[PDB]
RNA sequence: UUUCC
């Protein structure tokens, strides 16, 4: 196919993406930046003591607590699934270069042998039924906005007052914008209502990534992460190249004079996309009600809170298969965007709104700075959005899009390889809807719990069970992809939304339990993805508002991990060796300070009443709001806490907008 | 100095 058109920042098509204000102009030109993060107040991620501590702790834990994962990927025993070398990165210094995002993934899907559409009429009915059950009996709620998040293109505002106006104006003009777009007038819709333009592409750190220690050599080896250069991204991989980014941290020595201990590497960087907020608002105003619906009526499959919440569902199963999807977002199929839109139109959704939604999934991307001297290039033409990047992370319903794709993909897997007898129940729209409605409520012999690309597939006793074992066996074999839609395999060390499924000697769901992933405690405490941003006065606007609070929820979140005690002690000990102080005491102080600071933000918080009213979820979220993105939902957090992090647009304004969008 | 329960 066509190479995607590309425009340098100086071109008028890219200039038009940035308003005439300093923030926007700076965001367009920002060059590649790196530097140690402030892991905790006053402590840099590359401080020699800190790196010395990480070297001792990581070797020690790996030594004493080797992974306990069987050949079917189930974890048992110490609850450890891999070594602990993941903490060995110079946080804040990225691998170079980061990837150019692929402008079209059609070829990437075809070459991996994935389908370019529903392969059978049955699958077509199931994807559409997913749309009818998800988008149908919605209740308006206010549109909530994350504090301090940017409106990206074209204003790049972080001001709540300005964001609320942008959103309200957007709900008011979405209809006119959509209609413009239905007429092919995208430049007009963008110019008049800022609905269009591009996603603003930033690079985020995945702070821990695999590292192994080669026994032969005595040297550590970091996992290679492949990246696409510009030619490759704009040609969907037909030209250019895909190569291993460089994680070597040696350079930090001559560049910054930072001492780099042996076996420490640069961080894996991932692309992140900020959507043009005027376009996302009208999408988010539908998305939230959709979530409220599936997390209530289809709570069994989609609403996951605690380890025990998950556990209750899974222990009733006779077989539990922990799947893995490779690179979900970039393999996500545009044909599903078109199928969902087509079905929304059949259900009676406003065409103008469907068009806004369709366009949000075909938008050009403005690439910032993947490496020193590269970037500042707009991929795709905003005048006629036609990219196929897969799923953009900043689209307003990204989680729902991944969840609809995968939930149906895993059901198909179960039907295809284990439950042929259920096919006669899926004959037309009504029966598809009935069957999927029952399956999602956990009422069938095949079940699943999922969220985007994480899931656990279940079989109760019955006809499908024997097929379930053959599927599992097929996955263990790993030679044949069990799905025509995405690359599915089994998770090496089964886990679900952060909890590892700990199996005893019987290796059966009924006697298994969900424990916290101890390695994640270590990633969160010693390799955060951001520094403490102590320069940002308003903590509610920071990426890590109250880091100290996580100490208070630690026992609750990881206390069930078998080596919990051991890990806390190895930490205390290495921290002693490295810093001459008690880590525990260090965290109790951090805990007290943040606990006090938090009352400055909580109205109902007696200007010093404890943390008495806060749940463990509340605490993890206050220390790391990102978990509200990949793990929990607004509804899982105390309302007074929710207000610290979010602000809403009037219920009356969203209600009126939603009435003009929905069928009935 | 920049993203979506
Ligand atoms: Mn998993």
Count of strand segments: 22
Strand count, sense and barrel status of the largest sheet are:
6 strands, mixed
Number of domains: 4
Shape: globular
PDB class: transferase
Keywords: polymerase, transferase, oligonucleotide polymerase, transcription, structural protein
Assembly: dimeric
Entry title: The structural basis for RNA specificity and Ca2 inhibition of an RNA-dependent RNA polymerase phi6p2 with 5nt RNA. Conformation B
Task: Tell me what the structure shows.
β16 (about 445-450) and β17 (about 455-460) form a beta hairpin. This protein has four domains: about 1-30 and about 100-275 and about 335-395, no CATH class; about 35-90 and about 520-605, Phage p2 RNA dependent RNA polymerase domain (Globin-like), CATH 1.10.490; about 275-330 and about 400-515, Alpha-Beta Plaits; about 605-664, Other non-globular (Dihydrolipoamide Transferase). Helix content is about 40%, strand content about 15%. With about 675 residues, the chain is an alpha+beta fold. It has a six-stranded mixed β-sheet with strand order 1-15-14-7-12-5, with no helix packed on it. The protein is built from 26 helices and 22 strands. Manganese (II) ion binds near residues 454, 491, 495 and 496. The chain binds one RNA strand of 5 nucleotides through α2, β7, β12, α10 and α16. The PDB classes it as transferase.
């Amino acid at each position: 196919p066509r190479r995607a058109p590309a425009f340098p920042l100086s071109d008028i098509k890219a200039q038009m993406l940035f308003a005439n204000n300093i923030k926007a102009q700076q965001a367009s030109k920002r060059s590649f930046k790196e530097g140690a993060i402030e892991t905790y107040e006053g402590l840099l991620s590359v401080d020699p003591r800190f790196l010395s501590f990480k070297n001792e702790l990581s070797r020690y834990l790996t030594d004493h607590f080797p992974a306990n994962v069987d050949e079917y990927g189930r974890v048992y025993g110490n609850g450890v699934r891999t070594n602990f070398f993941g903490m060995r990165h110079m946080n804040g210094f990225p691998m170079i270069p980061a990837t150019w995002p692929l402008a079209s993934n059609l070829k990437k899907r075809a070459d991996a042998d994935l389908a370019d559409g529903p392969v059978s009429e049955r699958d077509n009915l199931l994807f559409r039924a997913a749309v009818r059950l998800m988008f149908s009996d919605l209740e308006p709620v206010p549109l909530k906005i994350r504090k301090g998040s940017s409106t990206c293109i074209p204003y790049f505002s972080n001001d709540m007052g300005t964001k609320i106006e942008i959103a309200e104006r957007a709900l008011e003009k979405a209809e006119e914008a959509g209609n413009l777009m239905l007429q092919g007038k995208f430049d007009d819709a963008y110019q008049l209502h800022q609905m269009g333009g591009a996603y603003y592409v930033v690079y985020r750190a995945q702070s821990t990534d695999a590292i192994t220690l080669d026994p032969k050599t005595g040297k550590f080896v970091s996992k290679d992460r492949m990246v696409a250069d510009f030619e490759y991204a704009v040609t969907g991989g037909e030209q250019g190249s895909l190569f291993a980014a460089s994680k070597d941290a040696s350079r930090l020595k001559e560049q910054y004079g930072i001492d780099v201990p042996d076996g420490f590497f640069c961080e894996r960087r991932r692309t992140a996309m900020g959507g043009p907020f005027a376009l996302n608002a009208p999408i988010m105003a539908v998305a939230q009600p959709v979530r409220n619906k599936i997390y209530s009526k289809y709570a069994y499959t989609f609403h996951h809170t605690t380890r025990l919440n998950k556990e209750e569902k899974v222990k009733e199963w006779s077989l539990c298969v922990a799947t893995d999807v490779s690179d979900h977002d970039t393999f996500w199929p545009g044909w599903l965007r078109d199928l969902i839109c087509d079905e929304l139109l059949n259900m009676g959704y406003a065409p103008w709104w469907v068009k806004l939604f369709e366009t949000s999934l075909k938008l050009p991307v403005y690439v910032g700075a993947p490496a020193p001297e590269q970037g500042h290039t707009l991929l795709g033409d905003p005048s006629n959005p036609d990219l196929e990047v897969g799923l953009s992370s900043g689209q307003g319903a990204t989680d729902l899009m991944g969840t609809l794709l995968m939930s149906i993909t895993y059901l198909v897997m179960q039907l295809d390889h284990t439950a042929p007898h259920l096919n006669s129940r899926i004959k037309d729209m009504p029966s598809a809807c009935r069957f999927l409605d029952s399956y999602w409520q956990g009422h069938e012999e095949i079940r699943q719990i999922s969220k985007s690309d994480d899931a656990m597939l279940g079989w109760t006793k019955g006809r499908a069970l024997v097929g379930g074992h053959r599927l599992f066996e097929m996955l263990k074999e790993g030679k044949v992809n069990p799905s025509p839609y995405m690359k599915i395999s089994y998770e090496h060390g089964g886990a679900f939304l952060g909890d590892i499924l700990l199996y005893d000697s019987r290796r059966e769901p009924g006697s298994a339990i969900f424990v916290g992933n101890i390695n994640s405690m270590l990633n969160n405490q010693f390799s955060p993805e951001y520094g403490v941003q102590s320069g940002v006065r308003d903590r509610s606007k920071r990426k890590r508002p109250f880091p100290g609070l996580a100490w208070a929820s630690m026992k609750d979140t990881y206390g069930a991990c078998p080596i919990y005690s051991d890990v806390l002690e190895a930490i205390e000990r290495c921290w002693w060796n490295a810093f001459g102080e008690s880590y525990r005491a260090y965290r109790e102080d951090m805990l007290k300070r943040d606990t006090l600071e938090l009352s400055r933000y909580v109205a109902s918080m007696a200007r010093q009443a404890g943390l008495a009213e806060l749940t463990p979820i509340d605490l993890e979220v206050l220390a790391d709001p990102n978990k509200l993105q990949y793990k929990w939902t607004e509804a899982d957090v105390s309302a007074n806490i929710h207000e610290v992090l979010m602000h809403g647009v009037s219920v009356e304004k969203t209600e009126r907008f939603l009435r003009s969008v929905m069928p009935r």
